[PDB]
Amino acid sequence: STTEDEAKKFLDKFNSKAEDLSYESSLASWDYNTNISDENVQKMDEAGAKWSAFYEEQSKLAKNYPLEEIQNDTVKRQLQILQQSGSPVLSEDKSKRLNSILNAMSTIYSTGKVCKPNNPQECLLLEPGLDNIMGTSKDYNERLWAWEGWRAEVGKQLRPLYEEYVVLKNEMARGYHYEDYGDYWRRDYETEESSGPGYSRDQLMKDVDRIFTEIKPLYEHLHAYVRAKLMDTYPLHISPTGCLPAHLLGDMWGRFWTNLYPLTVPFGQKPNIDVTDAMLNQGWDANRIFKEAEKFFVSVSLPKMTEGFWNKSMLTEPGDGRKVVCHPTAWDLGKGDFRIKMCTKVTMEDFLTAHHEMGHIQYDMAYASQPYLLRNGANEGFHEAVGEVMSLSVATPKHLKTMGLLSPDFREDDETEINFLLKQALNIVGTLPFTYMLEKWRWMVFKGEIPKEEWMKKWWEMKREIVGVVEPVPHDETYCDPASLFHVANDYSFIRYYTRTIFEFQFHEALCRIAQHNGPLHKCDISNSTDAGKKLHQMLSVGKSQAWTKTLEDIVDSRNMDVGPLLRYFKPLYTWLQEQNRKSYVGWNTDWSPYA
Ligand SMILES: *[C@@H]1O[C@H](CO)[C@@H](O[C@@H]2O[C@H](CO)[C@@H](O)[C@H](O)[C@H]2NC(C)=O)[C@H](O)[C@H]1NC(C)=O
Ligand SMILES: *[C@@H]1O[C@H](CO)[C@@H](O)[C@H](O)[C@H]1NC(C)=O
Ligand SMILES: *[C@@H]1O[C@H](CO)[C@@H](O)[C@H](O)[C@H]1NC(C)=O
Ligand SMILES: *[C@@H]1O[C@H](CO)[C@@H](O)[C@H](O)[C@H]1NC(C)=O
Ligand SMILES: [Zn+2]
């Protein structure tokens, strides 16, 4: 017979085995995460080792299958995603060296701490001490000391480890017939199967550069406004026409500017919308929050939650008989099992995180009939986008008013609108240049255009160009500041947090185009709409069987990355910032430095 039927039978056998194998592995990981002990860790390790061995064996048996002679799309994409394991391309010495380097970097990041001067015993860890310090303290010297200590503790020790890591990664990428590790990361967006506009790994960088250049005006206005607002609390630490200090962005690295909201609030006289008070007054619990989320989701013609999700997930902290580290995760155990692990409290942030997790669960249930290799999003930016569009549609005051959470006598004037827009921009807009510059620096380091003896010499250059922030103290070639982030020194991609921002606002407005919404975009509501829900479900059910460009154009009528919806959403805040910056300089000076 032909190779097509042989590959089909091989994939059928592989799926029939991997279903049960991944089911057992997911059960083990869930028993570990929900019951921390010493034997559960061993069981999870055995399950993971078995799953990895099976995956490697299937990759070896699939490598001998030619993709050129095969004409079908599903089997071709399945063999393509199966052949990309990563581990079995090198010898044992380099593999063990890379594994030891990864484990050492993870241990250094987990046990990293900063010791205050003149106190060798009072050393504070990163979480939750350093995070709280960088997010709540409004002092210059304290934040500067914390940043310098974290840098000198993490990068100074991870520099040679990161050097060997990037060397081994580039060598493995060259072994996998790839250009560099940046190519191995960008291979996720490459869909060489659509007849016509086929997306390539080189077009992704160009599209990201174009969308960054298009965001540049709004981000520059926002940065100028934040600088003008922070100039009141920092009279001699921030120049009006220069860059901003890196240790004053709300956290240790500057990924989110939300912590700067009390200092950059447009109108401090009006309080923000708070729901936890009405929830505590009306006697709300986790079950009520989840039932309200299920009702909101089924009002958009989406399926409801199954009884297994209700009697198997961990919606509340059990306590008194177990110890767990609970972070919001929408887990898919396979075979039609979907659970949510989260210690949801009676608040508003947890109220939105519940809707986020329910959207993630709905997205996972959308492709429940797709093959195991296609039981995921088309790219790494659709999951979080689908999770965030629901939170955007829920956080509107209309949903809180017509459902019994906010008083009907709440006047919605432009002050609260500007406040909400600025609060959203401090979290969504302030991360795009940071993510872009981090991914570009990592790609250029993988490609070899930045020699080691100049790595940092470039890291602080783009910081002044792309983001517009200047370092507080000069760093020589012994620091490895970029590795101070969790996602950087963990073999984790970072562009997934960028494209989602484009993929989120594109979807929302699109739904608002079907629900016949009129007026501003920040007052949209997808609830009580069957037409938009049908298109949403049809877009979510495709999973990974089709190219991401086709899935995008089947939802927003555009087969390319477009940041237009983001500008249309932030147009009110854009005009407000343009009117406010009439007495301030827009832009930053690349040559200015705080230490002169
Ligand atoms: C979706 O529509 C339904 C019905 O049109 C809304 O439900 C009503 O809420 C009012 C009070 O605001 C009650 O008096 C009605 O009895 C409710 N009807 C039903 C059938 O329950 C619902 O609030 C709408 N949802 C949103 C988010 O606007
Ligand atoms: C959790 O683990 C402990 C010991 O590891 C065991 O005694 C207990 O029954 C487990 N709980 C559940 C719900 O399985
Ligand atoms: C590809 O295979 C799937 C199932 O393996 C089948 O449903 C589909 O029709 C095939 N496509 C073509 C073009 O043969
Ligand atoms: C949920 O599962 C438990 C067993 O863990 C069972 O005792 C209980 O009856 C179940 N509840 C429902 C509503 O099925
Ligand atoms: Zn999520």
Numbering used by the authors: 19 to 614
Paper text:
Among the SARS-CoV-2 proteins, the spike (S) protein, which consists of an N-terminal S1 subunit and a C-terminal S2 subunit, is critical for the recognition of host cell receptors and serves as the key determinant of host specificity for CoVs. Bats are considered as the reservoir host animals of SARS-CoV-2, and several SARS-CoV-2-related CoVs have been identified from bats. Here, we report that SARS-CoV-2 receptor binding domain (RBD) binds to bACE2-Rm with lower affinity than that to human ACE2 receptor (hACE2).
The cryoelectron microscopy (cryo-EM) structure of bACE2-Rm, which was expressed in HEK293T cells, was also determined, which showed no substantial difference with bACE2-Rm from the SARS-CoV-2 RBD/bACE2-Rm complex crystal structure. The results showed that the SARS-CoV-2 RBD could bind to bACE2-Rm–expressing HEK293T cells with a substantially lower positive rate than that of hACE2, with 34.5% bACE2-Rm–expressing cells that stained positive versus 91.6% hACE2-expressing cells that stained positive. bACE2-Rm contains six potential N-linked glycosylation sites (N53, N90, N329, N546, N660, and N690), and the structure of hACE2 has been revealed to be highly glycosylated. Overall, the structure of the bACE2-Rm extracellular domain is composed of an N-terminal peptidase domain (PD) and a C-terminal collectrin-like domain (CLD), which is similar to hACE2. Superimposition of the PD of bACE2-Rm and hACE2 yields a root mean square deviation (RMSD) of 0.711 Å for 559 equivalent Cα atoms, indicating the highly conserved conformation of bACE2-Rm. The structure of bACE2-Rm is highly conserved with that of hACE2, providing the structural basis for cross-species interaction of CoVs originating from bats.
